């Protein structure tokens, strides 16, 4: 289930005409390009070494698109100010997500095009890639405007065409690195909790991709147990743990299991004194 | 391959 996304952001700045604009491209949830308007002279830059096999023409063409998007978001922010009847002395945020999911048979599985204003759903292209879901009264103005102009056809063309073709290009060009996994390294720690009770904490460290499943079992039955959100280690890998409160002396009846696509075999761990 | 948006909001 390969994917490509572009996550874009414009933040207006009170007293300045130009918002800050930032675009980030992803393949399979990993950053591979980024554009930032606040840079010295802004360009799309490669965020993964395999992208450096793209030539000057590619970077120049992508950068000109960003310059376009930057203007597009500026006008849109000003329009939104009108629709919501807001004041110009504040900061406001416009975000966009777009891109595609590709199956193993190279069929487009889903196309995405979504906007948010002030961190709330504004308008989105439906799964049919033909019609719009507007989330509030203001967004209906945009919907009408975009239905009038046939905007959806433009995005459909991109999603069904360039998005899937270029993602395949990238998969081909970056295959080895794009398919690389890191296995989780797991261990169990033991902590006092209260009288008669202790905490077992099952750790998974150093894994990639971020997707993972941690489970606790009593005898051989699964449980429900504190589970932290998966978090970046800062070195390209991820961490997670799952803990359970168990009665003193029953620690050996509890077993942790770790499931990750990077492992050659699911892990089964117990607390080891 | 970045997207180019059509008409503004």
């Amino acid at each position: 289930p390969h994917s490509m996304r572009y996550f874009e952001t414009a933040v207006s700045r009170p007293g300045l005409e130009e918002p800050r604009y930032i675009s980030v491209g992803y393949v399979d949830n990993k950053e591979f390009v980024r554009f930032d308007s606040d840079a010295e002279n802004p360009r799309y830059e490669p965020r993964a070494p395999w992208m450096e096999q793209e030539g000057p023409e590619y970077w120049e063409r992508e950068t000109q698109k960003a310059k376009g998007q930057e203007q597009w978001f500026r006008v849109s922010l000003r329009n939104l100010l009108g629709y919501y009847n807001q004041s110009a002395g504040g900061s406001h945020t416009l975000q966009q997500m777009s891109g595609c999911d590709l199956g193993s048979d190279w069929r487009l599985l889903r196309g995405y095009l979504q906007f948010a204003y002030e961190g709330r759903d504004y308008i989105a292209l439906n799964e049919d890639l033909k019609t719009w879901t507007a989330a509030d009264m203001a967004a209906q103005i945009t919907r009408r405007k975009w239905e009038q102009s046939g905007a959806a056809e433009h995005y459909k063309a991109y999603l069904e065409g360039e998005c899937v073709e270029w993602l395949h290009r990238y998969l081909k060009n970056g295959n080895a690195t794009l398919l690389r996994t890191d296995s989780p390294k797991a261990h169990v720690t033991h902590h006092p909790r209260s009288k008669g009770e202790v905490t077992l904490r099952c750790w998974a460290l150093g894994f990639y991709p971020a997707d993972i499943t941690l489970t606790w079992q009593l005898n051989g039955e699964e449980l429900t147990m504190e589970l932290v959100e998966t978090r970046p280690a800062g070195d390209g890998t991820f961490q997670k743990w799952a803990s359970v409160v168990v009665p003193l002396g029953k620690e050996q009846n509890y077993t942790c299991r770790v499931y990750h696509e990077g492992l050659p075999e699911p892990l089964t761990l117990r607390w080891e004194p | 391959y970045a997207i180019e948006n059509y008409l503004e909001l």
Partner: protein, 97 residues
């Protein structure tokens, strides 16, 4: 949206061994935020900040980190200021989590 904070080390901590302390801040909006990391109540001057990113639910996230060497007694914290909160939110490092 009120920012969520995790404070944790890059590697399993060993006293006396150079490590990285992370402060992972998520679920916030708007993206302007002030993050400070503190050692024994004192502002740490060399703190790295990841670039700005947001996730599928539109909320932003960011990773602050700093070089540190855990000891038995030094305490570390991450202090976050954001317009969604009245008081700055401080989360202390717990090596067990």
């Amino acid at each position: 949206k009120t920012p969520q904070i995790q404070v944790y080390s890059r590697h399993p901590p060993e006293n006396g061994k150079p490590n990285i302390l992370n402060c992972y801040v998520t679920q916030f909006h708007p993206p302007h935020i002030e993050i400070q990391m503190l050692k024994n109540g004192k502002k740490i001057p060399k703190v790295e900040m990841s670039d700005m990113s947001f996730s599928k639910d539109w909320s932003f996230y960011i990773l602050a980190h700093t070089e540190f060497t855990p000891t038995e007694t030094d305490t570390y914290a991450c202090r976050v200021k954001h317009d969604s909160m009245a008081e700055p939110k401080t989360v202390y490092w717990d090596r067990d989590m």
